[PDB]
Structure formats: structure tokens, C-alpha cells
Amino acid sequence: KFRYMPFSPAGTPFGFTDRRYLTMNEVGYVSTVKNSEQYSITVSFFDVGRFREYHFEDLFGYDLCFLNEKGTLFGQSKTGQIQYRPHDSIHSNWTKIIPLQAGERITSVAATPVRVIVGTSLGYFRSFNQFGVPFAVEKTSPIVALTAQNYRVFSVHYSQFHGLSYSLSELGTSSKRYYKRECPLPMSLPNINSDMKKDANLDYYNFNPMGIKSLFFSSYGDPCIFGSDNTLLLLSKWRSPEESKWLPILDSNMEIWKMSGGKETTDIHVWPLALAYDTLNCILVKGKHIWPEFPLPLPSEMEIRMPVFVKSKLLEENKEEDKEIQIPVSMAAEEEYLRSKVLSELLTDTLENDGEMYGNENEVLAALNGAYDKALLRLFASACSDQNVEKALSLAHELKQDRALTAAVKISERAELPSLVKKINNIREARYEQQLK
Amino acid sequence: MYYGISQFSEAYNKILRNSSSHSSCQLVIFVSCLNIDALCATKMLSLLFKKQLVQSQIVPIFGYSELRRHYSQLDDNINSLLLVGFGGVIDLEAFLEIDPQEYVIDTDEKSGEQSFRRDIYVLDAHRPWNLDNIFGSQIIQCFDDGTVDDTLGEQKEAYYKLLELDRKQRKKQIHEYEGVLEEYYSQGTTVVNSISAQIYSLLSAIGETNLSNLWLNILGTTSLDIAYAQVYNRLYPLLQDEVKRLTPSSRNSVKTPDTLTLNIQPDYYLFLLRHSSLYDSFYYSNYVNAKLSLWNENGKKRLHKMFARMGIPLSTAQETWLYMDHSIKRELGIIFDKNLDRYGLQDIIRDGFVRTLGYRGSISASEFVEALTALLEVGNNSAQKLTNLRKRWVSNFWLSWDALDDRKVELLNRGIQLAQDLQRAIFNTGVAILEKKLIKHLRIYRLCVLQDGPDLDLYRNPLTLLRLGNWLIECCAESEDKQLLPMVLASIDENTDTYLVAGLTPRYPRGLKKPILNNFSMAFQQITAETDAKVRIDNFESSIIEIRREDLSPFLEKLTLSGLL
Amino acid sequence: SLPAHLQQTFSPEEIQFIVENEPIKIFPRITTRQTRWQLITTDDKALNNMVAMRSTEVVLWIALLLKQQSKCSIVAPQWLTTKELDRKIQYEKTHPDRFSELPWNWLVLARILFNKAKDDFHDPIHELRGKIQDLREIRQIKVLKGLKYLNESHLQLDNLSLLEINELRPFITEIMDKLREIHTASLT
Amino acid sequence: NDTNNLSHQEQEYLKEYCDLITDLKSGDLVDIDLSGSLVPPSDVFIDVRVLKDAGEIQTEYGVFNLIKDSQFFVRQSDVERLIQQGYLQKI
Amino acid sequence: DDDNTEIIKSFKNFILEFRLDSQFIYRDQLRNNILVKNYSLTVNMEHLIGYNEDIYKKLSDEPSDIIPLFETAITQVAKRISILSLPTFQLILNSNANQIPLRDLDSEHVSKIVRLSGIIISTSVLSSRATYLSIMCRNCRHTTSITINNFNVSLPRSCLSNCGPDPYIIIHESSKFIDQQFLKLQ
Ligand SMILES: [Zn+2]
């Protein structure tokens, strides 16, 4: 049966040892070691130019931790004791102890540049400024996870009596705004496997009874989460509630299956870190325990791809021993067109609302549009070679540039389809009129 | 001027900033040879600066006499200078040929802080601090652990008030502050901290901690245990935390040719246990000689008797410890628990640090420091000969520096081979001193003078002389319960016709509460200031002096007549 | 004028210098993207446009120059892994005359990266050091068989590394030259 | 760019060839030191130890004071000539 | 039966893996010896002890039995590093254990490794010992062979292919031999 527990982004259990990771993100990670009745904590950064790695001793046994590029926040789930540490020396650290009801415990904590947030098993929400001045208290579903990027904050909530849900908000200093409040979440649960399989990974489920492996904002503020099924999900169109939707953008298991030559190397596990545009930052872990250890192994990089393939069909198409399986060009072109379309739309929405950060992202969008038409031309040519004029004509509507339509005319000539040459030229003339208008 | 623990970081920052230019050698390090802690300290610093690409020069120095010489010749563009292991006891602005008006660049109108063209940094564990250096100076910059603000309230007050004061009230106030300062000054000399330890805190601050720096920390620290046990005991727990912190996960995995480990396990106050043999380990131990009186046969038979009762065949106890049988090696840790009590010898058991690298076998820090000191001692008209001797002793600094590198274990083995011979030769002199009863028991202190020997040249180096003194001190500490006394030890040289003299304190047994202080400093200084005698004082350690053959007896006569002992 | 040991051949130092001009993939720990590097024998854009933890490609000598300090990490080449080296040893055993198709700089690059970049591998280094040795030993057997075909006309070699050629150069060329002299003297 | 074993024609020959070398080394192509080192540059910075007491000396990069058995951490491009002359060792 | 294979496997893995810094010193020595047609290996005790003390313990307890196993392990490695025939290789040892004076050797030391020193006073001429040896069976005229090794044997009497009480004779025409020499130490 379910029970409430604390969480922090991508921590590890102690396992057999006296040390563990508390949390990880793109900026860095935090670790701690137990020394009889005391603990030692160490904070690490990947930008070694901008920050200093450092360490200090904890007597109170913190079990909660949250990191950003301004400071680190620490908490104790039973005692209610908390501490915030800026990365500069100038603003000295400060501490507080929060009231708790009998058996109540803190489940998660998070912080913006000016806001501090605490949640509990009994569904109480409390908030303070960067100097601990209390602002407000609210009663909600029990919270299980929290994350933030500048003023944008993303929350997850769960109850036996209300289901699984999420919230999205923006703590603007001009004003605070809610985009979603405890709306239903479609995430894949792990409980059936935990109850039936008896896999001796039970310690991980004790450590993380929700099985939510990690969650973070993209490099452009999109909300993202990695499921217990080892799939990456991203929320699209969040700015428009009648169009907002959840998208499955990468399955790790399918990648390892292809990488192994179509084999079941279950000894390999993927530990996610952060999402950089189109590429996942992750650790590839091997052996008994599905999470990394010390000293930290080097990260890896991996691209997202749409779920379109089938194992049996690809085995049939395929049919040195570990060679990665060969794929039909139709699947590759189809997947590219879908991936190009989704990427372009997300980038377009980002530019439409938040603009360019660097001054060149429009060029990437142009490249995506070129890739999109290129993929469609290959699929179109396949339809023409099959002499399916109806399907080829339907595909021709989706092409953007007249360069591509001209190429489609040449392709139709090679296919010896003058009817399709005619109808494409009708479309080109119609679209030329629309361009003249 | 001085900085504290809360800002050592800032001096390091200032030094980086201050010594920036690549057109010149903008940073210089002066280091005292014949000091292990100083050596490890310096090594740490050089690595630090290496990483930062700071062009610099390292110069080893013997004493005050050479200090002046080296300082004199310095270039004007030398923005930063470091004094490592000396100078905290003396007025440096007085000693050096300094006018501050010759070194001020800029005066900060706001702070009143004077920016000097050359900054002089001091790292020294010795106490008491010279007040002029701390309170007085603007060029001199000392690093202190808190001893200054913990200790020096009355003194700070007195210094400043005495300075500011320049009829009943005036007389009373000046006599008061003269009293304060005179009470502070002319105390005994003492060592209160580890150089390398302080450095390690800075490395901690910055974030430069690793096993290569922690091991140097341990080595530096460990050199204190023989003479300054109290200090060592204060420091020790910190080391355990660090060793437990930096040791990796997945412990007790299978070996590889690349695997390095550092771990806490038993160590024994036995002279170089993992080299030579078990029997030699007991026989030459400095503690065992005081506990069982090995200078005579009624002592040696006790050792034979012990091995017979312990169940170790005496012909195997003399085998080389690497080749000794595996079963005895693993059973030894329990055999000692059953047998050392009957000989009053339980203090042999303790914990220490051991390091191993690949397949080449273990070594403990306690053994390592003996190898390094041996290399310092024996590595390979009157003024010219003294210069040649003091120059030879400086080459051994580099013969020891190059042995701190894992790529050069070949040199470390040579160091160990020399250490064994040094202890052998020391023991063969100690027995002669005791059996001929050359110790003279004067009322105030104990006197001993070596007029001849099998080869008396070995005692011409200060470190060897101190090893012999530390042998005799353990013997005197355990031979009777009564009369903890100062001791004076001297050795003649046939080329100079001068006696090399050292003044040594007593100390309390290992197993037993403020520390005592060495008072020979002020006594030798006062007799030197008074005396007709031809004498020399230029060593960093002021408890060691030199005097001509005919002048030893009048000097010692004036010394014993003095109330300063 | 030029030294006697450099009349006909390259020393191993020059071989290392030649190998150092190749490109390599790195992860930087700092961002340079908005002084500038202004190099004259390479591209300059890559170093001026680095972003932290974004993969990029640079010449090997600059990569080692950065890795001397905290600012960089080096990605190992894909052939330098246990799986690939296993397959190459199996190829070597299977085909008793052909040489396996390892890159021309494999020895030099392995013995550079094991010294300068021991921390950045994924495989345990004490296994790679064994498999590199196995490859070199098998190739030496195959070389010793081949020196029985020195002749008056020519020889063909395939996939033999630069350092391996340079090791053998003064022997092969000298003996071959003397066989040529003996043969042509009988024609004239 | 000592003499007793050379014949006098050889004694003038050597002087003539030295004049030729310095003529090539001067003028155009002066930027590359034709009489310099032929071993490829391995490292920028090195540690060098002081072998002979030549006292204080001048060099194009600056001034050095060669206190016997002191050690420098310095760029190789500077001290290459002093290593060749034999005042220094690389350690 | 299995112990003979585990011990050989252990010494085989010793030669293939002992690095000190970056050179596999025993693989290199074994290869460099074969090129000059020297079939032997000079192992050092301290390296064996450093690698694994248990192997040295086995060697120290029963040297007459274990030295042949290590010698055949050397042969098995020698083939891998040089063939895509060789004799059995000779093992040679170096040690720094305490010297025993020659006058103190006694009944406590029988079948132990001993290190000593002295002056050579006499040398014999060379003589021949057998290693691989071929046999003919007098009655049935069947044939077989035997492999000797020189550690502390006689012709067998289990007749094969009744075949008789003592039917075996030696074919010197198809057998292999080695050199042996005697010395005196004072
Ligand atoms: Zn028969």
C-alpha cells in the first residue's frame, strides 16, 4: 500500500553505505556522508569558473535539499528544521523551525530568487520571502514534488481520494499568476510491478514510493518529467488551456534495445540529469543498483525521437552480432517529419512569447522547416512510386516552399503522373495567388 | 599586521592579484631547511601556485646569517615574498634594513591602509609572537589561528597605551605597561600548531582538497609526535574525519596495479616495523629502551624472555618482516594483547595511518618521516669550511624534496637504508654514555659533554644531535620518578675547536596539564650579551649555540651562577 | 648541419607532434560565448563560442592544454572501448595474415590519453591497458613473419600504424636497397 | 655561432663559415632562430633547478639571479638557452 | 585432481597481469628471452609476495611439488605471445631472505628453500638426464612414452596390450635429454 515520504530531485538511497547523493541538476549536485552521530555535506558545480565547491557539517540530519544558481535550501522532514544558504558570503545564512502536527512531515521544498516554499504530508502549504518573512498559508492536496526556474514553478500533488494532479504557476513580482491548479496528470504508475515482481529493487520504491524518477524545466522553461516506465514526457501548449497537451517524446528502453542489436541488456539503466534543447543529459549506470555512485561518472548526451517503431517488424526488416538494427527509410522519414514538426512548434511558441535569448534561434527554426519539407518529399516520392496519386496529392498539401513543390513536380514527372503534375501545378498556382494576395 | 582564520583566503587572493605579471619573477618563497613541516608546507604551496600558473622561485635558507644575505640582493619588482618556517619570534622590521617610506606605493585615503610595493608574509608555529610584527608593522603580515586575539588582550592594550603615552599618574601608567610587556616577554619558547595543518584549512576554503594534499597534511603533522605529543593529540581527530571522508565507496574491493588506498589501522611506536625484522623493531625502539633498560644484559635477557613466552621462535623473530611467516603476521595483533601487560609495556598499542599503491606494499606515516629525516641528515680558514658544510646541508633539502613523488620510490628506499644505520650509531653511543656514567648531576640541571667517540662527526649536524638527546631524555624520564630537570648536551669538533651545545627540556611519560616551556633561550641570550666568550647565535632554533674550546667552562660557570635556569 | 639521427627518419617526438594536430571532442566547464583567441593555424570560432557542458571539437594540443586545468573534459574515441578492442582481437586471430583496421595513430593516442586523461574514461582503465598489449603482441608476430619476403621490387602493407612503420623503417629500407644493388649489378 | 689542433687553413675556414651563418641568421627570415632547438615544443611551463653559480644575468625576457640550488617555475622558451649553456637542469 | 589446475591457472594469471608502473615486466622478459632462444624466466620473490601472499605460502610449504606446476604455466604463456616446438621452460628465482651459515643447516631444514653462500671448490663434467622418453614393450611389441621431471622414479611394470612381468625397454632413437652438473660449496 501507498505511504507518504520525502523527495528531492534525483537523489540516491544510502544503500549498504554511509553516503549518498541528495540531489542533482544541470548546475551541480549535493552529497553527504555520515560520521557516527553527525553528517558532512559537500556541494559541487559543473561551472567551476563561476562557483566554488565547498563543504560543511550538519548535526541535525537533513533529509531534504534544493539547489539553484543563487543558493541551496536544506530541510529536516521530522523536526521541521530548515536552513537556506546563499552562494555568496555577503548575505549570511539563516535558519527556522516550522510547526508540524503529530506525525506530519515535510515532503518537499523549493525556492525562487525571492520566494521560499514548504509542503507537508497533511497537505499544508507555507510560503516565506528570502529573509523568512511569512507571506501566506494554504490547504491543498498533499504535495509530492516541486521544481522552479526563475519565476516559473511546477508542482505535483497526489491523494487516495482525489487522484494524481499537477499545478503550474508564475510568481511574478508584478503579480502572481496560476496557469493550472491541481488538474489531472496522465503519468504511468509503478505500483503493479512493485506488488507483483518482487525484484529486490524494493529499496528504491521505499526510497521513492511515487517512482517519479526526476522532473525539471527545459532549457526554455517547458515543464518536463521522466516516468517510472523510463519515458520522457513534456507539456506542450501550456499557455493555451484549450490546446495544452502532454507529449511522449522519448523512450529510453527502445533506444537501449536498438543499441544492443535488439537485445535485452537489462543490466543497463539510464539516470536523467537535465534537458538541453533536443538532447538529454544522462548517466549510463551498469549493475545491480539502478542509480550512480562516487566518484561521479562522466555524463552522456542523447537525442529525443518520436515513438513510431515496432520490434518484430524491425527484426523482420533486419533479417558483428550486436549490430544495431536497420530501419525502413519510411519510418526514418516519418519520424523525422513528426520530430521536426513538434520541435518547430515548440520553438515557435517560445519565440512568440519569450523571444530569442541569443539572436540565432530563428536559424535553427529555418533548418527545421527545411528538414520537414525534405522528409515529406521522401514520403511523397514513395507514394508516387507506389502510384497512389490520392495519398501523394494529400501529402503535397503539407509542403511549404515552392522549391519543394517544384521538386515534387519533377518527382511526379519521373513517376510519369501528368495528372499529379497538373494538380500540383494547380496547387502551386493557387498558392502563388495566395502569396500574391 | 596580522590576518585570522576568517580571512586567510583574502591574503591568497591579494597575492594572485599582486604578483600577476609574466615579465618578471613576481613571487619568492624562503623556506627553512632542517624542518620537515616547513618542507611539506612548501610542497603544498608549490602545487597550488603551479595550478594557477604563477611564476616563482623557491630558495632554502639555513639561518639568520643567510637570511640577511638573501634579503639584501632582492629585485624591486618582487611584489610578494613568503617566509615559511621562521621569524615569528623576532622583530622583522628591526632585523631587516627597512624604512616603510621606501616601500609605500599608495595610501588609501579612506581606510588609511598603506599599499606596499613588497608584501612580506609569515608562516610560523613558534610562540610567543613578537608584538612589533603583530601590532606594530604595516609591511609584515602574519597568519594566526586565534592565538593573538585569544591571548593578547593585556599586551595589546599595554603596547598601544605605552606607545600613545610618549607626574604621579604618568609614572604609574608607564610602570604598569612596562610591567605588562616585561611579563609577556622573556617567557620560554614553544610550538603550538602545524604549518601544513593551517595550509590545509586554506585549501579547504578554496576547494582544493584531494588525497595528495591530505597525505602531505598527515606527514607534516606526524613529525610533531615525538617532541610535541600534546599538539599531535589535539590535531589527530581532524585527520580521522578527513581520511574517512575522502576514501572512496565500494571499499575492500579486489586489488589492481593502479589501486591507491589510505586507511586507519594499528601502529606501534616500534622503530620501522615493516622493514628490517620484528626483533630489531623492539630492540631499537626509543620507548622500549627506557622501559626494559636495553643498555645492559639484565635488560636484553628480558626481551629474549618476552619472545619465549609470546610463543614466537627467536630465530623467526629475526627474519626480514616481509618474508616472515604469514600466520605470525596475522596472529601478532592478538599476541600483544595477552603479553605486553606483564612487562608494563601496554603503551605500544595505538592507531595510525597506512598507505599502499598497487602491488608494491604498505607503508605508515611514522615510517615515512624517519626516511625523510634520515635523508636530510646523511644525504650527499674557518669561515670557508663552515660555508662548505652549510652548503652541503642545503643539497639534502632537494634530496628529500624529490622523494615526495610516487615516481621516485627508489630514492625513498635509500632513505630507509640510511635511517637504520643512523639509529644503530646513536644506540652505540648512548650505551657508552650510560655505562661510563658521563652524565654529571648538578643541582639545577643535568650536564653531559662528549669529548671523544667512535665517530663524533655525526653529531655536528643539529638533527642528529637532537636524536641523541631524545634518546637520553626517555632514559632519564623513566629511570627515576623524581627530579624532572633541564639537560645540556655538547660535542667538540677538532677542526673548529668549538663545542656545539643544545639545551633540552624534560617531558612527561606517554600514558599520563598545561605544557612546559623551554627557557634556555633567554639564558643563552643573557650570557651571550654579557660574556667575554667567543660564541655564535644564528640558528632558527635559539636553544642551540656554539662556543670555542677554552670558553666552554667560563660560559657554563656564568650560566649556572645565573638565576635564569 | 642537421643531426645524424634525423637524416632519413622521424624521431618519436616528431611522431607525437604530428599526432597532436588531429581534432578531438570535449565537454567544456565554462562559457566563452557572449577577448578572443585569434589563432592562425586552426579555426578560431569553436573556442570563441563555447558553452558549458555543450559538446564541441578542437585540436588535441589545445584539448590537453585545457585539461591541464579544471576547465575541460575529454571524450574518449569510440574505438577505445572494451567491446571494440575485443572485436579487433577476434579479427586478428581469425585472419592470420591481414592486419585489423585500427586507426593510424592508435598506439600514440592511447599512451597520451592514459597519462593525461586517466579520469575521463567509462571503462576500467586496468582492462584497456591489457587489451592494448594483446593487440600489440599479435601484430608483432605478424610482422616477424613478413620480414621473410624482402625482395628486389616492392612490398604491400595494410593498416600498419605510423609508429609501427617508423619503428621498422631503417631495417626494411636498408636490406631492400642492398638486394636491389646486388640484382642490378648482374644486369649491367 | 681550443684552436690548437686545427691546421691554419682550417682555422680561417671555421671563421669564414661563422660569418656565413650569422649572415643567414640576420636580415630576412630573422624571426625564426635557425640555430635554436630542433626538438618539438612539449610544454610551455617547466620547473628548473640551479646548477652553477653564474650570479645575476640578463636575458631578453628579463633578469635572473642564479643562487646555487634554488628552483624556478618558469616558461621554457626563456630558459632554453641557459639550459643549453649548462647553468640549469629540468627536474 | 582440480587443485593441479587451479594452481597452474593462478601462476598463469600472475605472468599475464603484473605491472609495476606501465610495463608488463614478465610478459616483456618472456618475449625478449625467446628471441635469443633462451627458454627460461627469472622471477623475483618480492613481486610474487606483493601480488598475492597465498601463492607464496603454497610455494614455501611444498617447493618440490609446486615448482613443476609453475614451470608448465610459463610454457602455456610462452605459446600465446609467440605462436598464432618449444621445450619446457626453466624457472629461476631471486630472493633477499636471511642467509643461513652453511654450518647451521640441520634436520629442521629438509625440503625447505634455503639461501646461503660460500666458495666453489670443484666442478664436474656435464652429464645427460632424460625428460621425454619412449618405451617399447618386449612381448606384444606395443609402444608408449613417459615424461620425467627432475624433482624429489623408475621404469613401470604395468604391462599393456599376459603381457609379462617386466617387459619394457627404452628406444634411445626417439627420446629427449638435458644437461646436468655437480658442484661443491665450501
Ligand atoms: Zn602388451
Curated annotation (Swiss-Prot), chain B:
What domain of life does the native source organism fall in?
Answer: Eukaryota
Q: Which residues cross the membrane?
A: none
Signal peptide extent: none
An example of a GO molecular function for this protein is: DNA replication origin binding
| InterPro entries reported in the protein's UniProt record | CDC45 (IPR003874)
The task this protein performs is described as:
Required for initiation of chromosomal DNA replication. Acts at the origin of replication. Also has a role in minichromosome maintenance.
Additional facts recorded: Present with 1730 molecules/cell in log phase SD medium.
Family, according to the entry, reads as follows: Belongs to the CDC45 family.
Quaternary structure and partners: Assembles into a complex with MCM5/CDC46. Interacts with MCM10.
Name listed for the protein in its UniProt record = Cell division control protein 45
Q: Which organism is it from?
A: Saccharomyces cerevisiae (strain ATCC 204508 / S288c)
The organism that produces this protein has a lineage beginning with: Eukaryota, Fungi, Dikarya, Ascomycota, Saccharomycotina
Q: Which gene encodes it?
A: CDC45
Swiss-Prot record, chain C:
What biological-process GO terms show up in the record?
DNA-templated DNA replication; double-strand break repair via break-induced replication
Where does the UniProt entry say this protein principally localizes? nucleus
What do the Gene Ontology cellular component annotations say? Answer: CMG complex; DNA replication preinitiation complex; GINS complex; nuclear replication fork; nucleus
CDD domains linked: GINS_A_psf2 (cd11712), GINS_B_Psf2 (cd21694)
Q: Which domain of life is it from?
A: Eukaryota
Q: Which Pfam families match?
A: PSF2_N, Sld5
Subcellular localization? Nucleus
Q: Which InterPro entries match?
A: GINS_A (IPR021151), GINS_bundle-like_dom_sf (IPR036224), GINS_Psf2 (IPR007257), PSF2_N (IPR056784)
Please verify whether the record's keywords include Disulfide bond: no
Keywords of the record, alphabetical order, are:
DNA replication, Nucleus
> What is the stated purpose of this protein?
Functions as part of the GINS complex which plays an essential role in the initiation of DNA replication by binding to DNA replication origins and facilitating the assembly of the DNA replication machinery.
Binding partners and assembly: Component of the GINS complex which is a heterotetramer of SLD5, PSF1, PSF2 and PSF3. Interacts with PSF1 and SLD5.
Record's family? Belongs to the GINS2/PSF2 family.
The molecule here is called: DNA replication complex GINS protein PSF2
Q: Tell me the organism.
A: Saccharomyces cerevisiae (strain ATCC 204508 / S288c)
Q: What is the lineage of its organism?
A: Eukaryota, Fungi, Dikarya, Ascomycota, Saccharomycotina
Swiss-Prot record, chain D:
Q: From which organism does this entry originate?
A: Saccharomyces cerevisiae (strain ATCC 204508 / S288c)
Q: Localized where?
A: Nucleus
Q: How does it assemble?
A: Component of the GINS complex which is a heterotetramer of SLD5, PSF1, PSF2 and PSF3. Interacts with PSF2.
Q: What protein is this chain from?
A: DNA replication complex GINS protein PSF1
Misc remark: Present with 1431 molecules/cell in log phase SD medium.
**Family per UniProt?**
Belongs to the GINS1/PSF1 family.
Annotated function: Required for DNA replication. Functions as part of the GINS complex which plays an essential role in the initiation of DNA replication by binding to DNA replication origins and facilitating the assembly of the DNA replication machinery. Required for the chromatin binding of CDC45.
From Swiss-Prot, chain E:
Which Cys-Cys disulfides exist here? none
Q: Where is the protein found, in the record's own terms?
A: Nucleus
Family indicated by similarity: Belongs to the MCM family.
The miscellaneous remark of the record is: Present with 10300 molecules/cell in log phase SD medium. Early fractionation of eukaryotic MCM proteins yielded a variety of dimeric, trimeric and tetrameric complexes with unclear biological significance. The MCM2-7 hexamer is the proposed physiological active complex.
What this protein is reported to do is described as: Acts as a component of the MCM2-7 complex (MCM complex) which is the putative replicative helicase essential for 'once per cell cycle' DNA replication initiation and elongation in eukaryotic cells. The active ATPase sites in the MCM2-7 ring are formed through the interaction surfaces of two neighboring subunits such that a critical structure of a conserved arginine finger motif is provided in trans relative to the ATP-binding site of the Walker A box of the adjacent subunit.
Subunit structure, interactors included = Component of the MCM2-7 complex. The complex forms a toroidal hexameric ring with the proposed subunit order MCM2-MCM6-MCM4-MCM7-MCM3-MCM5; loaded onto DNA, forms a head-head double hexamer. Interacts with CSM1.
Q: What name does the UniProt record give this protein?
A: Minichromosome maintenance protein 5
Organism, scientific name: Saccharomyces cerevisiae (strain ATCC 204508 / S288c) (Baker's yeast)
